[PDB]
Amino acid sequence: LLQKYVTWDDKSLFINGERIMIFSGEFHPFRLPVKELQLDIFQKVKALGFNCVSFYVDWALVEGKPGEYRADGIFDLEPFFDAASEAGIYLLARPGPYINAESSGGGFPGWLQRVNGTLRSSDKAYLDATDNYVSHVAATIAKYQITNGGPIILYQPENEYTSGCCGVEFPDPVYMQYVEDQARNAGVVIPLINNDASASGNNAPGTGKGAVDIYGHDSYPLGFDCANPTVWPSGDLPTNFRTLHLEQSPTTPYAIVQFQGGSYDPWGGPGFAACSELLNNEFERVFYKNDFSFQIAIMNLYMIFGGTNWGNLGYPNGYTSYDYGSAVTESRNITREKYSELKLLGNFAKVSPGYLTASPGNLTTSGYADTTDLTVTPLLGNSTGSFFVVRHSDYSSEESTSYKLRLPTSAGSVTIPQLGGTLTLNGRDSKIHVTDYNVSGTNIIYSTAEVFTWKKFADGKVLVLYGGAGEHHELAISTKSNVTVIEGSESGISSKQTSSSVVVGWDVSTTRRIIQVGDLKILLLDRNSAYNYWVPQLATDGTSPGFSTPEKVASSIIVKAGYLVRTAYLKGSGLYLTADFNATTSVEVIGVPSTAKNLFINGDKTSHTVDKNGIWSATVDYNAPDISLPSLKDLDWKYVDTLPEIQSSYDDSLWPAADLKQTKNTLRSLTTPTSLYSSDYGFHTGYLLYRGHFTATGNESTFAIDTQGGSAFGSSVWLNGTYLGSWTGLYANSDYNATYNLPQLQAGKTYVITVVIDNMGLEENWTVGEDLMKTPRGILNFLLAGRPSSAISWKLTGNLGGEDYEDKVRGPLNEGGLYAERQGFHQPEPPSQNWKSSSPLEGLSEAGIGFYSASFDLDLPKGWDVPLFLNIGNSTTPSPYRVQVYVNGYQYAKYISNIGPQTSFPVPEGILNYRGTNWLAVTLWALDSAGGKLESLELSYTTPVLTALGEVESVDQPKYKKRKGAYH
Ligand SMILES: *[C@@H]1O[C@H](CO)[C@@H](O[C@@H]2O[C@H](CO)[C@@H](O[C@@H]3O[C@H](CO[C@H]4O[C@H](CO[C@H]5O[C@H](CO)[C@@H](O)[C@H](O)[C@@H]5O[C@H]5O[C@H](CO)[C@@H](O)[C@H](O)[C@@H]5O)[C@@H](O)[C@H](O[C@H]5O[C@H](CO)[C@@H](O)[C@H](O)[C@@H]5O)[C@@H]4O)[C@@H](O)[C@H](O[C@H]4O[C@H](CO)[C@@H](O)[C@H](O)[C@@H]4O[C@H]4O[C@H](CO)[C@@H](O)[C@H](O)[C@@H]4O[C@H]4O[C@H](CO)[C@@H](O)[C@H](O)[C@@H]4O)[C@@H]3O)[C@H](O)[C@H]2NC(C)=O)[C@H](O)[C@H]1NC(C)=O
Ligand SMILES: *[C@@H]1O[C@H](CO)[C@@H](O[C@@H]2O[C@H](CO)[C@@H](O[C@@H]3O[C@H](CO[C@H]4O[C@H](CO)[C@@H](O)[C@H](O[C@H]5O[C@H](CO)[C@@H](O)[C@H](O)[C@@H]5O)[C@@H]4O)[C@@H](O)[C@H](O[C@H]4O[C@H](CO)[C@@H](O)[C@H](O)[C@@H]4O[C@H]4O[C@H](CO)[C@@H](O)[C@H](O)[C@@H]4O[C@H]4O[C@H](CO)[C@@H](O)[C@H](O)[C@@H]4O)[C@@H]3O)[C@H](O)[C@H]2NC(C)=O)[C@H](O)[C@H]1NC(C)=O
Ligand SMILES: *[C@@H]1O[C@H](CO)[C@@H](O[C@@H]2O[C@H](CO)[C@@H](O[C@@H]3O[C@H](CO)[C@@H](O)[C@H](O[C@H]4O[C@H](CO)[C@@H](O)[C@H](O)[C@@H]4O[C@H]4O[C@H](CO)[C@@H](O)[C@H](O)[C@@H]4O[C@H]4O[C@H](CO)[C@@H](O)[C@H](O)[C@@H]4O)[C@@H]3O)[C@H](O)[C@H]2NC(C)=O)[C@H](O)[C@H]1NC(C)=O
Ligand SMILES: OC[C@H]1O[C@@H](O[C@@H]2[C@H](O)[C@@H](O)[C@H](O[C@H]3[C@H](O)[C@@H](O)[C@@H](O)O[C@@H]3CO)O[C@@H]2CO)[C@H](O)[C@@H](O)[C@H]1O
Ligand SMILES: *[C@@H]1O[C@H](CO)[C@@H](O)[C@H](O)[C@H]1NC(C)=O
Ligand SMILES: *[C@@H]1O[C@H](CO)[C@@H](O)[C@H](O)[C@H]1NC(C)=O
Ligand SMILES: *[C@@H]1O[C@H](CO)[C@@H](O)[C@H](O)[C@H]1NC(C)=O
Ligand SMILES: *[C@@H]1O[C@H](CO)[C@@H](O)[C@H](O)[C@H]1NC(C)=O
Ligand SMILES: *[C@@H]1O[C@H](CO)[C@@H](O)[C@H](O)[C@H]1NC(C)=O
Ligand SMILES: *[C@@H]1O[C@H](CO)[C@@H](O)[C@H](O)[C@H]1NC(C)=O
């Protein structure tokens, strides 16, 4: 419509007039705020065979103060976009304004709790509130569209606009049309795509006002039961997605904008390791090939890399880690087998244009395979090839199943295997068998083994096939030439030549075989060996791979290596590879250009040999250096009391008064004389402190109080210095009604009730009209028994300044309301020389909150990517306590001893300074009259990786500076 660079038809997108299958991964820049590591992820995604990344922008992080848009430094989208371009990865931009995303407010800033109108509706107050954010974020996106030479090809307005309640005329076409117009008015001309939470047809082309350009929906078919990772429940495998697609949006390519790539894990859950097991390689091969059986043309995996909910950006139900059990782990490693398996499918899609021009049929339990225990879904082409997706009919089956195929080809129907034996499907696996597969003019009549990749080089053609262990396979090629085995044993390889073809049968082996048929070389691999192959694009003009255009795909090389191959480029007589290694690694290059004489790996000339088939070989030795990490318990820990409020000398006269007679919160009307909702006073994040002043009569007995912080929150209450008690918290409770006995009080004396409340984050707003994001935080109800409720005059604080937030570098969410946070002591070089010496391992002897500070040095070597972890012990059932850890001012750990499950906290290079000084600030809150302490506190690492990554620059780490506006 509005530009010629990205168009579509009923089958696929076109980019500059060429069909492409968009295979994408979800990656959120605000969860990895280090620009060099963003590039690392993009390159790891490109190495899967993927061509796109989908991202959210978090409004809450970039407009913490209403009217002040700030997407600078660590929140700057421009280096993220340049890193996508450099990696050769297109982008799907999803700026919301509502994003959900397991984030605080679902993206909405806390100040939306004061908006007089329904969130995500036509109400003018809501739409006005979004205008400054969208005109800024969409203008930045506009500048980096493909129409302006950037990477961004598609735009998503809103997020899962799918269910309404409570008087909203859902779906509101005026609402969606306004949201789409905002983006258009900011210069966005690329196609708009939506993400219906289920396949319900909302906003599809043809629905009139508020229709998007391309209809997308989401799917998490296997669910989120991470505690039972081997259980695949009955009927969870979708079978009707093409049927629903033809009914709801037949004119647009079939698109799943969020397909399950992992799972969330709540406070108290089984842990993200368990989620990786549920959504593992078996899940991918069965569920993702099933999506291929519907001829999906835009597929985005949520998440490909999850990262971290640092600095309180997460929603209340989640904890610090957002690992998500995804293909790329929270610590950026690609060890999980699901990565290597996904790489096989991504590379298959990258070289198979006939996939998008075929004609999909219904699944069948007969006609293609000779057992009803198997299901085959055909994608049939006239001359462009056909595809046959095979799985067990009972998709959860772990049975080993023998079968024969009867397939249609351009040379007629064929019963496979022709030369004898049977095919095998071992349990939770699925195959894409191919017929009339075009390898640059050479016709593969059929292959039962799956295609990984193929290329045409100057000196011939190469095709790479694989199968699982124990399987027999067969292929046929249209040709007059015979077959010869050119590498590996001739055993288990049977052949037959006809007048117009050669048939070849083979058993899968751990040892590679290479056969040759005319100018085609065919590598015959087992799955586990195929995991070690890579297909980098080969740059001749520079060093960057470029986007996956048909030309740059065709000129790729095949590299057998280990952990990672990032790039390849040719320059003069040098073949340059960039790669990473986690072990001593044999490197083989196939398709070396004729002009190349020398092999360089990561800048360094590397000796190579050339075997009889023209394959260059080399070795990269892995010899890890001594990684020396300091013992955190032995540091020079300085302590300060971070709850001075409970001492009688404390003067709170500069605190904001909690004296508002009316709330601006439309969701929940006041049940106290004044509002004690934190967001009414601009406080949306971290720990909240309330102080209630009263004069005693002498007859007081009890104080009852309803506190609300969200799932797994806690609160503690003191009367002057006297500890009344705590709600220690449960995932099940987002609020709690406590009743405390007071000590005997003195007539006419003044007292202060101090209340500490853990704000776990603001709720999401999934159902339009329910306004759940407005769920307040703080005190809902109180009663000083026998006294009118107006007896207590309340003051409060959250982060210092509230919406006039102090740390513009680290963003509006990072810090909360504790004394030591308000003073800025969590930053590098706090004024701690004369503070008491005490360690968090010594801890507290009564209920309270202590603040601990120490520095340490790292001297880790260059050229090594070393994932570092911060560990808090939990070997025995603990007393109830809560811990935050700030690393160079960035909150990178939130720990609740009694709820869990996280004890291991990754912290990226860039936040940590690998050749320099680092600062740890630790708050320790004992919700127990006997106090508490850490069992252990350790810094650890996992496998160092010899890496091609450039220098990781430290992010801005503003040091401590005295604050004018503090209560002091
Ligand atoms: C450097 O980077 C590298 C990446 O570039 C990285 O390599 C990767 O490492 C990861 C692990 O970190 C690998 O992923 C695991 O792979 C395991 C091995 O299975 C795979 O490989 C075999 C063939 O290879 C083997 O055999 C040779 C010897 O012949 C050895 O050289 C190999 O080391 C390997 O041997 C191991 O496994 C044997 C048993 O299989 C053992 O006898 C032996 O002692 C070794 O432990 C294939 O046959 C496998 O295919 C079969 O199984 C898969 C998966 O189940 C099926 O899908 C397939 O159809 C075949 O049947 C397979 O490819 C896996 O065992 C391991 O599996 C599990 O963990 C994941 C979670 O991570 C789960 O999804 C999965 O369900 C499995 O869960 C079990 O294990 C975990 C504990 O780890 C439990 O939580 C869970 O409860 C469950 O345990 C229970 O069930 C099991 C039943 O059999 C059994 O363990 C117990 O009975 C138990 O009760 C996982 O997938 C990855 O493949 C590597 N990738 C590459 C490219 O190499 C390397 O680590 C990095 N290095 C460093 C130093 O950092
Ligand atoms: C790629 O990225 C991944 C994400 O970043 C990353 O995975 C994370 O890795 C860290 C570090 O390894 C994990 O933290 C550790 O978890 C250990 C417990 O989990 C284990 O328990 C089960 C074993 O049956 C399994 O569930 C689990 O395996 C599963 O998960 C694997 C992924 O990790 C997966 O591959 C498997 O297939 C499977 O699904 C796993 O085995 C935990 O033990 C460990 O804590 C110890 O180590 C810390 C660091 O040194 C110490 O500070 C800490 O105190 C613990 O050490 C002490 O306790 C141990 C108890 O046995 C002893 O072994 C130690 O020697 C030590 O002993 C002292 O203390 C004892 C009391 O505790 C006492 O008894 C002793 O006398 C002594 O005083 C740590 O928490 C994290 O969970 C992973 N995160 C996720 C999301 O998976 C992965 O590693 C990356 N890979 C690479 C190569 O980079
Ligand atoms: C340090 O080590 C200590 C000692 O081991 C660790 O302490 C243990 O920590 C466990 C995790 O917090 C804790 O188990 C939990 O205990 C409560 C008991 O009431 C229970 O609610 C928990 O189970 C639910 O919640 C978790 C998530 O927090 C879910 O993963 C789980 O499936 C359960 O979910 C159900 O309840 C939720 C409400 O909270 C619902 O949202 C959810 O949908 C689901 O609801 C269905 O089932 C309910 C009935 O079960 C029903 O009411 C509802 O209608 C639905 O049908 C979990 O068992 C241990 O008790 C605790 N042990 C000790 C000795 O203290 C500590 O965590 C470790 N610390 C660290 C840092 O790792
Ligand atoms: O990363 C998590 C992922 O969750 C996805 O939603 C999940 C299911 O797809 C969705 O059908 C289900 O819908 C729930 C809703 O989440 C709850 O608010 C509940 O009260 O009402 C609905 C019941 O049908 O929610 C699942 C998550 O638990 C999101 O679509 C996706 O964007 C992610 O957030
Ligand atoms: C193929 O599509 C539908 C799936 O809804 C199936 O029920 C039917 O047998 C086939 N369609 C027709 C028109 O026969
Ligand atoms: C096979 O691919 C070549 C490009 O290498 C193309 O010109 C030819 O038309 C293709 N043939 C078919 C039948 O798709
Ligand atoms: C093809 O190769 C086979 C097995 O190596 C051989 O026996 C046969 O004679 C060859 N075909 C022709 C036509 O020569
Ligand atoms: C309680 O604290 C206040 C000031 O915070 C102080 O003035 C008052 O005297 C204290 N009450 C008692 C009984 O000591
Ligand atoms: C919102 O203000 C409108 C007037 O603009 C008024 O009708 C309504 O009572 C107000 N409600 C709340 C909860 O603020
Ligand atoms: C606390 O009491 C209030 C007011 O009666 C009630 O509505 C709320 O549900 C209670 N909270 C819990 C967690 O039961």
UniProtKB/Swiss-Prot annotation:
<dbReference type="GO" id="GO:0004565">
    <property type="term" value="F:beta-galactosidase activity"/>
</dbReference>
<protein>
    <recommendedName>
        <fullName>Beta-galactosidase A</fullName>
        <ecNumber>3.2.1.23</ecNumber>
    </recommendedName>
</protein>
<feature type="glycosylation site" description="N-linked (GlcNAc...) asparagine">
    <location>
        <position position="765"/>
    </location>
</feature>
<feature type="binding site">
    <location>
        <position position="56"/>
    </location>
    <ligand>
        <name>substrate</name>
    </ligand>
</feature>
<feature type="binding site">
    <location>
        <position position="159"/>
    </location>
    <ligand>
        <name>substrate</name>
    </ligand>
</feature>
<dbReference type="InterPro" id="IPR018954">
    <property type="entry name" value="Betagal_dom2"/>
</dbReference>
<comment type="similarity">
    <text>Belongs to the glycosyl hydrolase 35 family.</text>
</comment>
<keyword id="KW-0732">Signal</keyword>
<keyword id="KW-0964">Secreted</keyword>
<dbReference type="InterPro" id="IPR037110">
    <property type="entry name" value="Betagal_dom2_sf"/>
</dbReference>
<keyword id="KW-0119">Carbohydrate metabolism</keyword>
<dbReference type="InterPro" id="IPR017853">
    <property type="entry name" value="Glycoside_hydrolase_SF"/>
</dbReference>
<dbReference type="GO" id="GO:0005990">
    <property type="term" value="P:lactose catabolic process"/>
</dbReference>
<dbReference type="GO" id="GO:0000272">
    <property type="term" value="P:polysaccharide catabolic process"/>
</dbReference>
<feature type="glycosylation site" description="N-linked (GlcNAc...) asparagine">
    <location>
        <position position="482"/>
    </location>
</feature>
<feature type="glycosylation site" description="N-linked (GlcNAc...) asparagine">
    <location>
        <position position="874"/>
    </location>
</feature>
<dbReference type="GO" id="GO:0005576">
    <property type="term" value="C:extracellular region"/>
</dbReference>
<dbReference type="InterPro" id="IPR025300">
    <property type="entry name" value="BetaGal_jelly_roll_dom"/>
</dbReference>
<keyword id="KW-0325">Glycoprotein</keyword>
<feature type="active site" description="Nucleophile">
    <location>
        <position position="258"/>
    </location>
</feature>
<dbReference type="Pfam" id="PF01301">
    <property type="entry name" value="Glyco_hydro_35"/>
</dbReference>
<feature type="active site" description="Proton donor">
    <location>
        <position position="160"/>
    </location>
</feature>
<feature type="glycosylation site" description="N-linked (GlcNAc...) asparagine">
    <location>
        <position position="699"/>
    </location>
</feature>
<dbReference type="Pfam" id="PF13363">
    <property type="entry name" value="BetaGal_dom3"/>
</dbReference>
<feature type="disulfide bond">
    <location>
        <begin position="165"/>
        <end position="166"/>
    </location>
</feature>
<dbReference type="GO" id="GO:0005975">
    <property type="term" value="P:carbohydrate metabolic process"/>
</dbReference>
<feature type="binding site">
    <location>
        <position position="324"/>
    </location>
    <ligand>
        <name>substrate</name>
    </ligand>
</feature>
<dbReference type="InterPro" id="IPR019801">
    <property type="entry name" value="Glyco_hydro_35_CS"/>
</dbReference>
<feature type="glycosylation site" description="N-linked (GlcNAc...) asparagine">
    <location>
        <position position="438"/>
    </location>
</feature>
<dbReference type="InterPro" id="IPR025972">
    <property type="entry name" value="BetaGal_dom3"/>
</dbReference>
<feature type="disulfide bond">
    <location>
        <begin position="226"/>
        <end position="275"/>
    </location>
</feature>
<dbReference type="Pfam" id="PF10435">
    <property type="entry name" value="BetaGal_dom2"/>
</dbReference>
<feature type="glycosylation site" description="N-linked (GlcNAc...) asparagine">
    <location>
        <position position="362"/>
    </location>
</feature>
<dbReference type="InterPro" id="IPR036833">
    <property type="entry name" value="BetaGal_dom3_sf"/>
</dbReference>
<dbReference type="InterPro" id="IPR001944">
    <property type="entry name" value="Glycoside_Hdrlase_35"/>
</dbReference>
<comment type="function">
    <text>Cleaves beta-linked terminal galactosyl residues from gangliosides, glycoproteins, and glycosaminoglycans.</text>
</comment>
<keyword id="KW-1015">Disulfide bond</keyword>
<dbReference type="InterPro" id="IPR031330">
    <property type="entry name" value="Gly_Hdrlase_35_cat"/>
</dbReference>
<feature type="glycosylation site" description="N-linked (GlcNAc...) asparagine">
    <location>
        <position position="382"/>
    </location>
</feature>
<feature type="glycosylation site" description="N-linked (GlcNAc...) asparagine">
    <location>
        <position position="737"/>
    </location>
</feature>
<dbReference type="Pfam" id="PF13364">
    <property type="entry name" value="BetaGal_ABD2"/>
</dbReference>
<feature type="glycosylation site" description="N-linked (GlcNAc...) asparagine">
    <location>
        <position position="116"/>
    </location>
</feature>
